[PDB]
Design a protein around this ligand. Structure first.
Ligand SMILES: [Cl-]
Ligand SMILES: [Cl-]
Ligand SMILES: [Cl-]
Length: 296
């Protein structure tokens, strides 16, 4: 009745966090052990392993620390007060049983690179798109991640917001089936790799990316058509469609990739024909094809 604020010491937050995940093991614990099944040297005693994580978290808050590297230590979720890590420029969370990232990713405002690997992660928070300093985002072996958040970037005025500094996006062995339309808004994206994922479709606006030089879609066995170029002037130099086993067609206007230097079609066993105007690709463009297409 006579209230007229406070803040739990991080060490108390971390002790509560350890006791919590030590008691409540659903989902994360088997995922963390599975991800590390070929690593018998990691700490697998649950309390000790969570304590190791807590200690690394506490260390990362100190000045000096540029990077938080969590490899094979358990981190089901970040403890509260994640804003303590706002100064970090690099973060890796690998084989950690990571189930979810903080809803307010703005708390990691300093990040220039983020790598998430071998986690049961099902979604990325929408606020991940507020990381304006993020240059590289890498997600590998996160089979339960089925969608990217949106918008990834937006454009007014013509002014740009969101992941405006992102240069490289890698999504390998994920459950992602399609990309947000806003992918085409990433003004600084130079390299897009989506590998071994059920990517089912790709829109032609991907060719409107102003700086995209490399598109690597290898092992996307659900992809059945590659989209037309149309008016797209993306300065694409490398197009890797290796082992897209169900790819049936390339567009007829594929020759509009006037800067193409490498086209890799090996393992495209269902690609019935090449476009006739594939002779119109640049002379010094290395084209690799499966045997059934070599004659053409
Ligand atoms: Cl560095
Ligand atoms: Cl800045
Ligand atoms: Cl979107």
């Amino acid at each position: 009745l006579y209230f007229q604020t406070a803040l739990r010491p991080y060490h108390d937050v971390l002790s509560q966090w350890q006791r919590h995940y030590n008691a409540d093991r659903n989902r994360w614990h088997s995922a963390w052990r599975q991800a590390n099944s070929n690593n018998p040297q990691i700490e697998t005693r649950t309390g000790r392993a969570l304590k190791a994580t807590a200690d690394l978290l506490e260390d990362a808050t100190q000045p000096g620390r540029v990077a938080l590297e969590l490899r094979s230590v358990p981190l089901p979720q970040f403890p509260d007060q994640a804003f303590r890590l706002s100064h970090l420029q690099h973060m890796t969370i690998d084989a950690a049983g990571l189930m979810e990232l903080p809803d307010t990713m703005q708390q990691f405002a300093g990040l220039e690179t983020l790598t998430l690997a071998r986690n049961p992660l099902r979604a990325l928070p929408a606020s991940i798109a507020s990381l304006n300093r993020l240059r590289e985002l890498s997600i590998r072996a996160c089979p339960e991640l089925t969608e990217l958040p949106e918008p990834l970037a937006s454009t007014d005025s013509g002014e740009h917001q969101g992941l405006v500094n992102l240069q490289s996006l890698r999504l390998e062995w994920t459950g992602i089936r399609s990309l947000p339309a806003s992918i085409a808004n990433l003004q600084n994206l130079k390299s897009l790799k989506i590998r071994n994922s059920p990517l089912s479709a790709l829109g032609p606006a991907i060719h409107h990316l102003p700086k995209l030089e490399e598109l690597d879609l290898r092992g996307c066995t659900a992809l059945r058509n590659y989209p037309p170029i149309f008016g797209g002037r993306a300065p694409l130099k490398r197009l890797i469609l290796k082992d897209c086993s169900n790819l049936l067609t390339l567009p007829l206007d594929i020759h509009r990739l006037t800067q193409l230097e490498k086209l890799d079609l090996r393992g495209c066993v269902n690609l019935s024909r090449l476009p006739s105007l594939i002779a119109q690709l640049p002379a010094n463009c290395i084209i690799l094809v499966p045997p059934h297409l070599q004659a053409q």
